Amino acid sequence: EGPPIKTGLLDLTELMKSQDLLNLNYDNIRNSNLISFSKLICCEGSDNINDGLEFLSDDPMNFTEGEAIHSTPIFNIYYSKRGERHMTYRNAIKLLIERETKIFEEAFTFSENGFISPENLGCLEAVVSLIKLLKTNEWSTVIDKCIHICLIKNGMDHMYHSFDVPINWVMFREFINSLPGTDIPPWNVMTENFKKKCIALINSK
């Protein structure tokens, strides 16, 4: 327990509490979500993502390897093995960011133009302002952090802290139920949980 360690947009103190990112396997870190990485971002005005990663280690890590076992109930064991020179924690974090930011931006396109498109920006403003008013529920902060991360990667970290709340609570329901849902991404369940909780809470309110 202690004050956060600010090395770029990363928070090493909050890395200490991220138990699923403390794997010593290159494949496990590489194949994580943006939710696991969202807890590490406290940029507070950072326009890039590849500065704090210089504080992450560059030593080789382990990677998984499989092998069949000669037994009557056949099965395959998967163990850890010393990786190559390019299997480092920093490289795994970079690959995680590169894949997951793209996946999320595709999941929150909301447009025929793209993620940065002004209509998508207004939709994201409405989504963030919903949580600005409605008390933070258990499935909101994760999305807020992911949106902030993807805005940093898209070069408009400026247009996240400049969010101005535009309230008629009946309008929210329509805008949200018509909001489309993903199928392939880990947000195939997350964003639907968010919509269900938000519509239920605004109905109660």
Binding site: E1, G2, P3, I5, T7, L12, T13, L15, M16, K17, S18, Q19, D20, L22, L24, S32, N33, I35, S36, K39, E54, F55, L56, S57, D58, D59, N62, T64, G66, I69, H70, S71, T72, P73, I74, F75, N76, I77, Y78, Y79, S80, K81, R82, Y89, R90, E138, W139, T141, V142, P186, V189, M190, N193, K196, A200
Partner: protein, 1735 residues
Amino acid sequence: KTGCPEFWKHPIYKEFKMSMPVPERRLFEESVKFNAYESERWNTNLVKIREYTKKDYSEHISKSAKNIFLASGFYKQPNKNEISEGWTLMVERVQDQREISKSLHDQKPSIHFIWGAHNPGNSNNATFKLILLSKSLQSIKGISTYTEAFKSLGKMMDIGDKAIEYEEFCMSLKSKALEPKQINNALVLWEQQFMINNDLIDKSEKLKLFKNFCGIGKHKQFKNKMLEDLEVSKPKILDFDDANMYLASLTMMEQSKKILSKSNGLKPDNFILNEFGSRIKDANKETYDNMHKIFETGYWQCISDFSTLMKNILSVSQYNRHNTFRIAMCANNNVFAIVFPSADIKTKKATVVYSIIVLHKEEENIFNPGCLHGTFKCMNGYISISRAIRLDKERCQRIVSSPGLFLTTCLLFKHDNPTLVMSDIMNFSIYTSLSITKSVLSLTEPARYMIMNSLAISSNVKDYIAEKFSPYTKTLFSVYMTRLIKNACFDAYDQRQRVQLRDIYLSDYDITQKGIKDNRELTSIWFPGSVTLKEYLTQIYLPFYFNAKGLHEKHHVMVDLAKTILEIECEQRENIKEIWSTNCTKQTVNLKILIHSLCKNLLADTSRHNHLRNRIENRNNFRRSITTISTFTSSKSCLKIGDFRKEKELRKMRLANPMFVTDEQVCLEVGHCNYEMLRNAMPNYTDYISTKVFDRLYELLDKKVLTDKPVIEQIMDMMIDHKKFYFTFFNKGQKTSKDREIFVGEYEAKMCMYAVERIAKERCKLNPDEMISEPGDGKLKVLEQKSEQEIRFLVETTRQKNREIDEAIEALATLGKIEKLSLGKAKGLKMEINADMSKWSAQDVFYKYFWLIALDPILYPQEKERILYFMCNYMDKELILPDELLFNLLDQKVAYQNDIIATMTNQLNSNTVLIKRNWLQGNFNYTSSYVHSCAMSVYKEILKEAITLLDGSILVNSLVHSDDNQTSITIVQDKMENDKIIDFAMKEFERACLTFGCQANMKKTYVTNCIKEFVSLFNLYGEPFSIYGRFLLTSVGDCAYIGPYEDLASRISSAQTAIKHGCPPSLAWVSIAISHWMTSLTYNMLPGQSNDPIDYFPAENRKDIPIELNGVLDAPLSMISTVGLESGNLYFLIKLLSKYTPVMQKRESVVNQIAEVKNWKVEDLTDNEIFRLKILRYLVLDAEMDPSDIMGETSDMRGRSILTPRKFTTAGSLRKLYSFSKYQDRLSSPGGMVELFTYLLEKPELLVTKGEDMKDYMESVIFRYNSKRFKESLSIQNPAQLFIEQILFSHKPVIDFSGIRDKKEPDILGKVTFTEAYRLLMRDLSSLELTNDDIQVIYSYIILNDPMMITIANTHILSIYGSPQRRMGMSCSTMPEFRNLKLIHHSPALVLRAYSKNNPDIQGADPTEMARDLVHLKEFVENTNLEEKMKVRIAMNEAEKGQRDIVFELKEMTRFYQVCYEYVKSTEHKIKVFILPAKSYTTTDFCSLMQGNLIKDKEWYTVHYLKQILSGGHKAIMQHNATSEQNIAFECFKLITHFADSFIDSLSRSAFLQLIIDEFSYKDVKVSKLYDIIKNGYNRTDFIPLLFRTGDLRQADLDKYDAMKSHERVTWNDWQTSRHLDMGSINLTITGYNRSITIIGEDNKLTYAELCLTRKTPENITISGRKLLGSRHGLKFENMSKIQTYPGNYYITYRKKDRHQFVYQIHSHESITRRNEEHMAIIYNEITPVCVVNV
């Protein structure tokens, strides 16, 4: 002080001695007289006897092991051909034993009901429905047997246009509450009750309707039955294997599905939805959709209508004259019932007779489950009438409670299965939930074992089907289910091959991923579709728990059980001649093998503890008084032998049996036998009665039989004083197809068996805190551990034996030789034998236990002689036939053809049968378990010898419960194929069981590859598994009807137990909703009913009322599972805390938020909040209002309930008690009860204890007889009678509510009703004052005092939900470091005993921890001002009255002790094993896993916390000396250094570490403080890199580090990736004085080693090698690859020493070659080189 000389002359001992060889007799007699306290060594006798029998044991082991080459691999496989042959044999046997009927009209009703959809057009008015029914009955068109009677019935219920007059007459009758009032051709007696009008019905038609149709009086009374009237025939059942019968059953099922799958045309709106729909939908939307679809179907309406109609039929079955009938209606305006006159339903074994009538617009639109009598045309459609149905109270209760069972079954079978159709599941579930007959039990009970054994690798299921399986198919659904079971058994084996193992992710410390793959390839059993393996096992095991308990009739079940016992006894008498055998004869024991195994096991067990006798004495209170042992002072039943003519005797009649009729009694009337005629008709009848254990102890103490001596001395004296043992039996009443006999014995037998059982228990490896009848879920973890170990053994071994093969094959992969090598590699094999023993207690060789007493080294010769004398007498016990069975057999009038009961009782000359070899059920659990473990040890030895014959590797594990056995075998060999090994293993398992007198059950024993099945618990290849549904279903069918809160609490506990076994959250919410709904139905508490509390308390809805006051449970599913029944108060307090905490403290720990409570104001509090806070302050933390009168109550007799309905106080049960007469004598005395009260007041500890000596125990028993609830615990509470109590008498006062601290009659009668109780409770609570200080006390002693509640509150407050994950590695976990979360160490009873006696060192507690427990209790008492308030109240009352009131002071003391007991009990939270998605290493890990596992059914999430949930407190900061802080610092730095080395860049590691040291904190202790502690300690040599990087290293540290070379200093310059699989770079360095070695290698090739010395000579080289490699380095050196050698070099070599121990040396090439080559010339232990050494 003296032994028993009588034992040597006993007939049983002489028989036992003459059956043994002469040397064995000498050994037994020398072992009995052996004194381990006077011999040179304690094990002189055991070692001598072990050596004497060693040769025979070795010969037996070797001969059994050599059979592995004689196996053929042809074991019992449950393929389709064998199942078909077994089925054919079964059909022949059942056709022989039953009368098979191929005709359809012999079918019994599958469901005792017919149903039709409601008419939306017609009105739902009772009078209009009655008029419509009357018009429809009269207009029946056609002619039949009862058409005229039905039309006459319709006529005699008409009212014409006098509906208004009928309504006013009914209202007038019901207002004041007989003479029938002529309305219009109707003799109305009451609302819908009519009198049979003789003018409207013909006499012949009336007789036909009431005798032939309803069975009312058609029979002849028992006094008039003659020889030609008794029925002799076999039970008639339908031909289940007939083609036409099966087609008819299929037609019935198809029609039921066609009619019942329609929509109701309504909107689903009920209690379950309106109360728990949000939670169910949040947990899983598909479950909400499924239940919403269920509510829309005709199935739900049909079953709800049947339940409601049954309730309305029962409610009017009280006052029925012989010439009347009643009409019952329900919410369906087309379904009615005619209730026919019978006995009062609330009388003994009374039945109800009804006939269902349905009006339907179109024919064939009738639900007819084999119950219809006829469909006749009438005006405007058709009218269907069913046959008359007679039912008893238990079957009516099952019908009433059916809807919850149906909903639970439908939702359990459909959970997460899109391939299943809801209609088929609903059809099957409605037919299995409304079944109240033994026809489907006879299929559900054996289907489990049949299908599980057919799915197994090897099982004996063919002979089970051919010999034991016997379907009992009286209904068409029975035929359908028999066909389903047959198809499942046919398909089980050929679909076994569709199960696949999950990929195993192991990491040298844990297995992250394991289990069975979840692919829907298996074929569903009960309905079309596909299921996974887990869903297959659920379908197999689930219908066994639908069955109703207690469907057996005493008349037949008593005779059945007596026949079973007597048949076993007669078979043993006339066919078991030899006691000892050597060819595995049934019911014989191999003498020498048994003796040797017992000697070896006793030597192993007694060597592990040097104070075993003291453990036995202390753990079982052997030196304490008899009154301090719970089992000797309980309310259980025991037997008394004597002369009880007066007690049991409760015009003359003669017996029906001609063999017991005197010539002067012929001119009399025949009557049912009772005690008087039984006593007169039996010459050698021994009299007996059943009393209570505590009352028997009271009587024995009063008559000076028992004294105040230590209990063990009294037991030893009783073992020789009590020579004749008598037992009786009764039917258990379990849900199986056949009942279990339970034996009740005397008190003295209880003492004698207690001593032996406790002696044998301390050697067993079972948990002393659990019971045999209730195995704990901790075994669920044990299984897992074993499996994991075996998995590792399978991975390391095969790999180790196939490394060379794989390497060569791979080099050749980039061919005939390839397959030649591949067939020469060692293969692995996994086997799981899941076995049960057949007739564990009945067909057992008791004589073997004799040796277990003779060979015991912890007993004296006198004690051994007395125990063996007791066992000899026990082998002479006599079983008393119950008087009811004798009544049954004395009124037959026809001699049974082959009567075993008459033969074994000398034509009923006596009522006792001598039972010799059958030690009765449950009397010798631990002794038998110990001998079973010895048998398994012998079997393991046989397997080890057999496998080492093949030069393979083996690992055998064996878990042994009472008789349940689970043996897991892992084998790795390259010799023979696996089927031969499996066949050998099973043959040797059977032979090992037969050697020790046991026998494997052909019904439950089977063999699998990847399925462990211990007691109701599964291990699916490393993954724990439990059928959680059996906890949900049992929560619906089982209800004691004690009260609303009691039933609700029991059901919530069942739901919590189901959650702990892996129940998905949506199903748990469904179970909780169903529990609440059923509890509200039973006690009329639904919105708008009589007892609805919503409008009596300041609550908007039921969520705002505590569940103790008939509210609903508002708590997260995480709190219920981890706390349970205290989650409502905790959640309410947390909601308050969140509501009234400033926003600057909203996201802090619960402690910091509670610290701000003092700034609250009571004025700005909602009335509901004040109400609930007052309840918490004065009803939970105090005893302001008594739920019942407390005089005579003890400290543990106050629950968490507030409104407790009264129950039965059976006077018949009480008058049998010897101490009750003494209590009644004392009560009717001038100054007896007041003197007793004064004595209790002078010695208040008797309120907590119950007397630790004779006089105090008797006084306490007499005092407790005043409790009025202790008397209700000694009485009979029939669940059926209590069920009809809530229907017949709903407005009767039942609650003994008595305000605030004293401010002809029905058997159950209270003082106020429920609504009056609510009103009085509100009137009294408003008189109390709540202050900010009171709220502080509430928060301080409900949350702040218990670390567990603080943790739970913090988890609810600080939780942050994270990434979704998939369940792949479910594992068992307790709460890590839970002992830090225990505020009070000891049990509440011990803590209260210590508090009352004011003594930290009591006869059962540790004086060190009891002091802390006492100081906790004293702090609670002082801070809540409990004692001060009690003293103030006592003084005020005494001043007001003038003289001291003993009654008031005694009541105040009782309240004080009950409050203290409840507070101490509220601390203990029995968090047992949980099943969690991942492995738990800390408390935070456990809480996060448990919280994230209980929010969605599809996936589990990751939960993080803003702050520390486990904040340091009174149990966390305290209890930690200097070494604890030392370990904390060590853990902190071990963690931080490696975290920096793993996740921090090299150039920023030192700065990061400096920041960690100077600024952060670990476990609430500053890191700087920890670093200072480790620098100022003797362990700084373990943190040299840390000291060097910071700069605090000294030359003294280096001298200390390199000065430990004296003990060969071993260091690992690098960690291996996996040290068990041998992966990762091996870089090892060993150093001593003037010698060092360094070894480098990767995986299994040690690349090289360097040996630095000071004298380069071969002698120094070898001595240094031995001294270095012999250290504790951890490198194996035998798992490394063998290398070639070159001359002049030195090599690290390994060699075998103890078949598992190895020697590592350094040798030369010529040395190795010479020694190996001379070793070849004559197992084969050769020096194997591994690595090269550079000297």
